[PDB]
Amino acid sequence: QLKTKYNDQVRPALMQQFGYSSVMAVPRIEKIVVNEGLGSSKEDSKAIDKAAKELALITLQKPIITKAKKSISNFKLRQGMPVGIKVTLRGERMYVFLEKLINIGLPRIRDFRGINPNAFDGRGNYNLGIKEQLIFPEITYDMVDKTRGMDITIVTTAKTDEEARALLQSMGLPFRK
Amino acid sequence: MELTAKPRTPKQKLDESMIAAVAYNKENNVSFALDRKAFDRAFRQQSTTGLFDITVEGGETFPALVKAVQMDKRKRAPIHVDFYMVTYGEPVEVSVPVHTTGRSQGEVQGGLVDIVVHNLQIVAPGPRRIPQELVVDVTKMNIGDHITAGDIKLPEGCTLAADPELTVVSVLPPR
Amino acid sequence: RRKLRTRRKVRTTTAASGRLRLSVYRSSKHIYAQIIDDSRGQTLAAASSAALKSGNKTDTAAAVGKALAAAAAEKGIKQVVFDRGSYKYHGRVKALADAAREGG
Amino acid sequence: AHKKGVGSSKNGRDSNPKYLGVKKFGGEVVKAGNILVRQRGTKFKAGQGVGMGRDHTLFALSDGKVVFINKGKGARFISIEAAQ
Amino acid sequence: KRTKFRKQFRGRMTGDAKGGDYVAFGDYGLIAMEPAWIKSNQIEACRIVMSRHFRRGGKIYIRIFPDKPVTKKPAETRMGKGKGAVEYWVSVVKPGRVMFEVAGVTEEQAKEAFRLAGHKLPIQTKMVKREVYDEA
RNA sequence: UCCCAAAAUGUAACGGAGGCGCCCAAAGGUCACCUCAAGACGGUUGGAAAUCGUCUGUAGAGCGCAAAGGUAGAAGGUGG
RNA sequence: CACCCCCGUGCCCAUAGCACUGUGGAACCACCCCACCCCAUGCCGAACUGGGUCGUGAAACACAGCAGCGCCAAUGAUACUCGGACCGCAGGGUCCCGGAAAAGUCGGUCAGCGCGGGGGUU
Ligand SMILES: [Mg+2]
Ligand SMILES: [Mg+2]
Numbered sequence: 072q073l074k075t076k077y078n079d080q081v082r083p084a085l086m087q088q089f090g091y092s093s094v095m096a097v098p099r100i101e102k103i104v105v106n107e108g109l110g111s112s113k114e115d116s117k118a119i120d121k122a123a124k125e126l127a128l129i130t131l132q133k134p135i136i137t138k139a140k141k142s143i144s145n146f147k148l149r150q151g152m153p154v155g156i157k158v159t160l161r162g163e164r165m166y167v168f169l170e171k172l173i174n175i176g177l178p179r180i181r182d183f184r185g186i187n188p189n190a191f192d193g194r195g196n197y198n199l200g201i202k203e204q205l206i207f208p209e210i211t212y213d214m215v216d217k218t219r220g221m222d223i224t225i226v227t228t229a230k231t232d233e234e235a236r237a238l239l240q241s242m243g244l245p246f247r248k
Numbered sequence: 249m250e251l252t253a254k255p256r257t258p259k260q261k262l263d264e265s266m267i268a269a270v271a272y273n274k275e276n277n278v279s280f281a282l283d284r285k286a287f288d289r290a291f292r293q294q295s296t297t298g299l300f301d302i303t304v305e306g307g308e309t310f311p312a313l314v315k316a317v318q319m320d321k322r323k324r325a326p327i328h329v330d331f332y333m334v335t336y337g338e339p340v341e342v343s344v345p346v347h348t349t350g351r352s353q354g355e356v357q358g359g360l361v362d363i364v365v366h367n368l369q370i371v372a373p374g375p376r377r378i379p380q381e382l383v384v385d386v387t388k389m390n391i392g393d394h395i396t397a398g399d400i401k402l403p404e405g406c407t408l409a410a411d412p413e414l415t416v417v418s419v420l421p422p423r
Numbered sequence: 424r425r426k427l428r429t430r431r432k433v434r435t436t437t438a439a440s441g442r443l444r445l446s447v448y449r450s451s452k453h454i455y456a457q458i459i460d461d462s463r464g465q466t467l468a469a470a471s472s473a474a475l476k477s478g479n480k481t482d483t484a485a486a487v488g489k490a491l492a493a494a495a496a497e498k499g500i501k502q503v504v505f506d507r508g509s510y511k512y513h514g515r516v517k518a519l520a521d522a523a524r525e526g527g
Numbered sequence: 528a529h530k531k532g533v534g535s536s537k538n539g540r541d542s543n544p545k546y547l548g549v550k551k552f553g554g555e556v557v558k559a560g561n562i563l564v565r566q567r568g569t570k571f572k573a574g575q576g577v578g579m580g581r582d583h584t585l586f587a588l589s590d591g592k593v594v595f596i597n598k599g600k601g602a603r604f605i606s607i608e609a610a611q
Numbered sequence: 612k613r614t615k616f617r618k619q620f621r622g623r624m625t626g627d628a629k630g631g632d633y634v635a636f637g638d639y640g641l642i643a644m645e646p647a648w649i650k651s652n653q654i655e656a657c658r659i660v661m662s663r664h665f666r667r668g669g670k671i672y673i674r675i676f677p678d679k680p681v682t683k684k685p686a687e688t689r690m691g692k693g694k695g696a697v698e699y700w701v702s703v704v705k706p707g708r709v710m711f712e713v714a715g716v717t718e719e720q721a722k723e724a725f726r727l728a729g730h731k732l733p734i735q736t737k738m739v740k741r742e743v744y745d746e747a
Numbered sequence: 748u749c750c751c752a753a754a755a756u757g758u759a760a761c762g763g764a765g766g767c768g769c770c771c772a773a774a775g776g777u778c779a780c781c782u783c784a785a786g787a788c789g790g791u792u793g794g795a796a797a798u799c800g801u802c803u804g805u806a807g808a809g810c811g812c813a814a815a816g817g818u819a820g821a822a823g824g825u826g827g
Numbered sequence: 828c829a830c831c832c833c834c835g836u837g838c839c840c841a842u843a844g845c846a847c848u849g850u851g852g853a854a855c856c857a858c859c860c861c862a863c864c865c866c867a868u869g870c871c872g873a874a875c876u877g878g879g880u881c882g883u884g885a886a887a888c889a890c891a892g893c894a895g896c897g898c899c900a901a902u903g904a905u906a907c908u909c910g911g912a913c914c915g916c917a918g919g920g921u922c923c924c925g926g927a928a929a930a931g932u933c934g935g936u937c938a939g940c941g942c943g944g945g946g947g948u949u
């Protein structure tokens with residue numbers, strides 16, 4: 072259930088593609104997240120639950136309610152009030168859910184075709200903006216509430232985006248060429 | 249320029265037409281007090297890209313460049329000066345004037361060419377051969393033609409201290 | 424981060440205290456259970472675990488605490504004070520403590 | 528009643544009695560209890576031997592001589608290099 | 612002319628120029644030789660005058676904006692507090708200062724662009740040219 | 748509470764501005780820990796700001812209210 | 828203080844900071860590894876923490892170079908002013924006498940000074 076081809080396919084192939092002075096200095100993956108900035112447009116003391124309950128069975132992790140920065144701008148805004156939802160993943164659970172996506176997640180996506188190329192976190196870090204939650208190996212509409220979405224963050228030691236992509240792809244990732 | 253005295257007391261001159269400067273480098277920072285008029289007729293030309301003979305009373309010719317002059321308000325009259333003894337292979341950096349030449353294709357056109365930056369300071373000049381001016385094109389310039397430092401030809405060696413893309417001049421429109 | 428060490432350290436009064444402080448660098452397995460005298464940038468004792476260890480390091484725990492408590496003896500110190508670091512007074516460090524906090 | 532503004536805005540009547548400053552200066556044989564500085568925030572920070580009241584006031588716990596120390600501004604201290 | 616927003620009132624005192632360079636933005640320039648209070652409306656009085664003499668090029672610099680509110684007698688009384696936030700706005704010029712400095716027009720088409728512009732100022736001014744090389 | 752007030756304190760005017768007659772079971776005691784504003788690139792209903800992420804970032808934020816002083820080794824932000 | 832270097836802790840607390848670059852490894856350090864429970868992240872043993880290699884030095888750190896930026900900063904002349912003595916109707920200003928800036932310039936530095944422990948000079 073992963074990590075060998077992680078190094079192997081990635082790591083080695085990396086020196087066998089690049090030239091790293093170590094295995095330490097090779098782009099890896101720090102953490103995968105699931106931001107759930109729902110509500111606001113939907114102040115459902117009830118809807119908030121859909122997410123967590125959900126996120127947790129598809130990310131196997133109780134998330135936190137990233138309450139409003141207390142920001143109270145012109146439109147609907149106020150103090151520190153439940154707005155979004157954060158769920159960070161690293162190492163295990165990361166790879167454990169991660170794999171789902173590389174395996175089932177995206178592959179099992181209606182209208183799916185691949186994912187955008189163009190550099191993101193010039194930090195050598197990549198970004199993923201998922202939408203409809205209806206494409207999850209867990210997501211059950213015949214057992215949920217309504218239907219929503221979500222955003223995922225790729226945190227990678229990658230110093231450069233060049234080094235990023237590869238890692239990202241070899242490790243499992245589709246590109247719409 | 250035959251400056252002679254150099255005491256801390258300028259009485260013996262403040263009345264008597266005589267300016268009061270100081271010059272140095274890092275070595276000697278000798279006290280100074282030259283003639284008003286002389287310097288007055290002097291600095292004019294050479295400005296700050298002009299070195300002249302400094303034979304302080306006693307016969308000890310010296311080489312220096314005009315550093316910073318601080319003249320009187322209420323009276324365009326000048327009062328204090330700074331000379332930076334010329335070096336040999338490097339003085340520091342200097343301040344060089346931007347100059348236009350040849351009628352511009354903007355003047356006649358319908359507008360007037362404006363020199364955004366009058367004098368311009370460039371990194372390293374090279375003592376012994378330091379540009380006491382800097383002619384510049386303008387003709388090509390038309391309806392809003394900006395010319396930056398990274399344009400003006402350079403006097404073999406000198407490097408531009410001023411940001412290149414910086415508008416040294418630009419043809420201004422009518423009204 | 425650092426904050427933690429400077430808060431802990433700062434909270435520990437210097438010469439208003441009169442007492443002495445014992446440190447510790449146990450984020451490594453190279454603790455240093457150092458003892459310093461307020462004013463003078465002097466160190467009175469110390470009882471690391473640098474002189475070998477036998478194999479233990481997170482285990483040499485109370486060892487170094489013991490190696491220090493009795494250590495001051497050859498100086499003769501009665502009142503001292505714990506200026507731990509980030510090290511949130513757990514077991515590893517509590518070691519040195521209790522160890523010394525009784526061996527003294 | 529009527530239909531305007533209770534009181535006329537933009538005034539300028541009254542202010543406050545006010546005090547503060549430095550009660551004891553550099554080299555004054557303070558005493559147990561003497562107050563040495565009325566400040567507001569922590570202009571002068573409690574040095575060595577100088578107890579600091581609740582209003583950032585600054586007093587002397589023991590006796591001795593008053594000492595002033597100011598490192599690059601920001602942080603200043605009043606100490607008590609006692610005589611004896 | 613007038614400032615865009617602010618506090619409201621002020622005071623009054625004097626000492627000679629402090630930040631009125633010389634050459635900058637132009638080849639010719641006008642300098643005030645007496646401590647005064649330039650009324651914004653006495654600036655317009657210049658600008659406009661100066662304009663007329665010129666047709667285009669607009670190489671006229673007014674480096675003396677009015678940062679200063681003055682006041683007035685509401686009619687007479689005295690029993691009340693400070694007054695007339697809006698009498699007008701003033702810009703304190705001091706000796707040596709530079710209110711004006713055209714550039715581009717003939718030496719002469721410059722010595723008239725001021726002459727007139729000088730006939731409507733509460734003080735005495737003289738024109739100037741170059742050798743002005745302090746900071747740049 | 749600022750300015751006037753003339754670098755100690757103090758100082759007037761129907762002089763120039765602004766607040767208070769409260770609030771907090773915890774917004775307190777102590778003990779642990781965290782640390783801001785803001786922009787840039789990249790990201791889902793979003794798309795101006797805002798939720799997440801990655802850099803910069805002595806703080807340009809915060810401090811129940813008015814301002815000043817003060818403060819990140821916290822007086823700022825959480826829990827026992 | 829025999830020479831060095833390294834780890835902890837000071838004084839000092841930007842002329843001791845930053846950056847760009849290079850040096851260091853298996854003594855030290857750090858990353859790293861696992862981590863059910865001790866104790867723990869309002870979600871994540873990321874950080875706290877418990878038990879430990881290898882591998883690396885890449886990151887972090889330590890060190891050294893360097894000055895493009897920061898930080899420091901003259902002198903000369905000046906602003907101002909105690910005191911003395913004057914001017915202009917007034918705005919304002921001057922003379923003699925001591926004090927004397929601020930900004931800028933010459934130039935300056937990428938510290939210095941301790942205590943203790945460790946490992947080296949095959
Ligand atoms: Mg005197
Ligand atoms: Mg006098």
Ligand SMILES: [Mg+2]
């Ligand atoms: Mg004098």
